[PDB]
Structures are given as C-alpha cells and as structure tokens.
Amino acid sequence: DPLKILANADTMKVLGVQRPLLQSTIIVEKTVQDLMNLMHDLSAYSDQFLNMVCVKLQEYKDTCSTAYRGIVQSEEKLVISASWAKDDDISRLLKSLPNWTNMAQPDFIRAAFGKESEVLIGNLGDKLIPPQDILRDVSDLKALANMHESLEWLAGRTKSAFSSLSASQMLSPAQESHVNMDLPPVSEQIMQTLSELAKSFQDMADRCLLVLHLEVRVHCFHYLIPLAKEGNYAIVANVESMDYDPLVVKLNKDISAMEEAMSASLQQHKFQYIFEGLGHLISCILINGAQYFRRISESGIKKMCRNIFVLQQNLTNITMSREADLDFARQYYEMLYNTADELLNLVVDQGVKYTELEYIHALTLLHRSQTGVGDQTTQNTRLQRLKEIICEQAAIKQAT
C-alpha cells in the first residue's frame, strides 16, 4: 500500500513538485505540519507535540523499510543490486564518483564510468545471474523510483522543521558563558531524534536510487554473459541476413521498459544517472566476453555487430547522445575478420588500442577458430611475437 497510491496532480502543484509523490508521504507530512502548527499556539505542550512528530515519522520510516525489503528480498536474501548498495565499501565508492556527486549540476565522468565498469566486470564478468538475483517486474522498479523521490522530499521537509526549531533557539559559543539559561523550547534530544529521522529518510532515498542504478547494470550481465557461451557465433553462412541474438533483443526491451518507468517517476538528472554509462559497461562486457567464445566465425562477428548496433540505437535514443564506447566494442570484433597474421600487422600499422590481454585473447580466439595458421609451434611463435610488438610500441611511446 504505502508505495502504490500516488498523490493527485493538484497536490503536486500545491507543493510545487513536478514528480509523483506517494500519498502516504503526503499524509505523514501533513500530520507533522499540523503538529508543528499547534506547538506555536499551545506552546505549553510543545514537547508532547514534538514527541508525536518523531513517533509518526519513526512509524513511517519503519513502514517504508518494511516495504523496501519486500521488493528487494527474493529467496530469503537480497538481489544483487540491493546487496551491493547495502555494502559499505561498494556504496562508498559509488557515492564518491562524479556521476553521483555532480548528479544535479548541469573526461572526468567518463573515467568514473570506467571505475564502475571495472568493479562490475571484475565481480560479474564471468557469472551466470539466476532469475532470483534480479528484479524483473518494472512495478518493483517503479515502487523504488518514487520511494526515492518521496523520501527525498520528506527528508527536505523534515530538515526544514528541524532547522526552524534550531534557528529559534540557537546560541553562539560566546553566549553560553552568560547568565540567562532561559529555557530551550525544545530539548536537545528531540532535536537529535528529529534531525536523524531527516538523515534516515535521505539515506533510504539514496539507497533506492543506488539500487535502481545498479539493477539495470546487473540486467546487462544477466542477458549478455550467456551471449558468448551460446555456440551460435561459429556458424558458416555464405549469405548474410538480419539474424541477431534474442538475448540482445530481450535486453533492449528490458532497458526500454525500465526507461519508460523511470522517466515518469524520477527527476531528469536521476534518470540520466541510471542510463548514462550503460554504453561503456556494455562495451566492456562484450570486449571482455570474447575470451569465452570457443569458436568465432565471420557470420558470428556480423551478428555481434548487429547486436551492438541494435543496442547502440536504443541507448543513443535514451541518453540523447551516441554511446561511442559501443563503437570501440564493434571495432574490437571487426579485428576478428583478419587472419592471425593480419591482426599482428594491424597492431604494427595503427598502434595499440586495446589492453594487452584483450589483444592476446583476440589472437587466441582466432587460433581456436581459424585454419590459416597450422601447427601449435607457429601459434606459440605468433603469440610471443604479438607480445613483442606490444612491448616495442610501449617502450617507443614512453621515450617520445
């Protein structure tokens, strides 16, 4: 219930908010408001009215926590995104990156994408994600999205209440050693309880947004990691067709459905935080995933390029900018059109662009797939010469 009924469109215009707010949040904030109004009139019972504010806010906090766990627990444990957000080290890293820190302000952020991708690839780049570890229903994602906006709003309202009380009774450090104790209209303990409820509503709001940000990314791994181990990219096709992976089609539908919900539930800069960076992550997934192919054929490369194109069109349309990292992943797979020897010539002619391991894994993939090399002794020799070509390129560049 408390994360379903949204406030009517005329309540938003009153409060001056341009995004859906939960009716339950509106109700508890109205009750706090009424309590705050009575403490100015019946100032003699200010403590009692304040204790009722804290209790009702604590009740709504507990009510939201319960609703959260119901969305986020699966088989008596957290889904991956929830597990990562709850984790201190991971949440600390994510909250320290410019895409979060500068979320509201209108390539440093592209380097922050590299850090998210590194953590995600490092821990998920070789894992099969079972269905019970992700959130499929957009209903749950939408519930998370306007729990975020609602609790962030409630945190702002609760913070204003605290600061109004604080400002009326604030003393300077020089005025402490003075005679007149007066009477603090509110005890420090009601103030501390109240300011912590405000922080708690913000922490809960931040968590929901983190979960949404990570959830789309985990979905990318769920659908794209099976891509490599399909045994479907080694087919020899003398004629070309518009065959591309159903998993990629499912990912696109998944991303689009989520894009639909977030746009109506979140402020734009929260929306952009969810969907920007997916291009970088997906390209990393596809480049890193090539090392799991047993065989690759020319038709398979054509199919992966269609996969990348389909994903590119969708993300470009969602983020309103071309995901250039997807071009980088396309160019990587186009390297596999070459022969094992031509691939080495490409590195000599145009320099080192991918990591050493990415080049080594490309050549090794070609050896497992192609036939224009022969015995293992010439393969080991070509592999060792590729490393020397990379060694030389580095030493040359560091000297100039």
Numbering used by the authors: 557 to 662, 674 to 967
Which sentences from the paper describe this structure?
The exocyst is an octameric protein complex tethering secretory vesicles to the plasma membrane prior to membrane fusion. The interaction of SAP102 and PSD-95 with the exocyst is via one of its subunits, Sec8, which contains a consensus ITTV motif at the C-terminus for PDZ binding. Previous studies showed that the localization of PSD-95 and SAP102 to neuronal synapses is mediated by the exocyst complex; they together regulate the sorting and trafficking of N-methyl-D-aspartate receptors (NMDARs) from the endoplasmic reticulum (ER) and the Golgi apparatus to the synapse. The complex also plays important roles in cell migration, synaptogenesis, and neurite outgrowth.
We determined a crystal structure for the C-terminal region of Rattus norvegicus Sec8 (aa556–975), which will be called Sec8c hereafter. The crystal belongs to space group I 422 (a = b = 190.004 Å, c = 175.275 Å), with two molecules in the asymmetric unit. One molecule contains aa557–661 and 674–967 of Sec8, and the other contains aa556–662, 675–732, 754–802, 808–936 and 944–967. Except for the flexible loops, the two Sec8 molecules in the asymmetric unit are essentially the same, with an average root-mean-square deviation (RMSD) of approximately 0.5 Å for all aligned backbone atoms. In the structure, we found that the ITTV motif is attached to an enormously long α-helix. The C-terminal half of this helix, which we named “spacer,” protrudes from the helically bundled core of the Sec8 structure. The spacer is sandwiched between the PDZ-binding site and the rest of Sec8. The spacer is slightly shorter in the crystal structure, which was due to the lack of visible electron densities from residue K968 to the C-terminus. Overall, Sec8 is the only exocyst subunit that contains a rigid long spacer that bridges the PDZ-binding ITTV motif to the helical core structure. The results showed no detectable interaction of Sec8c with either PDZ1 or PDZ3, whereas Sec8c bound PDZ2 roubustly, with a Kd of approximately 4 µM.
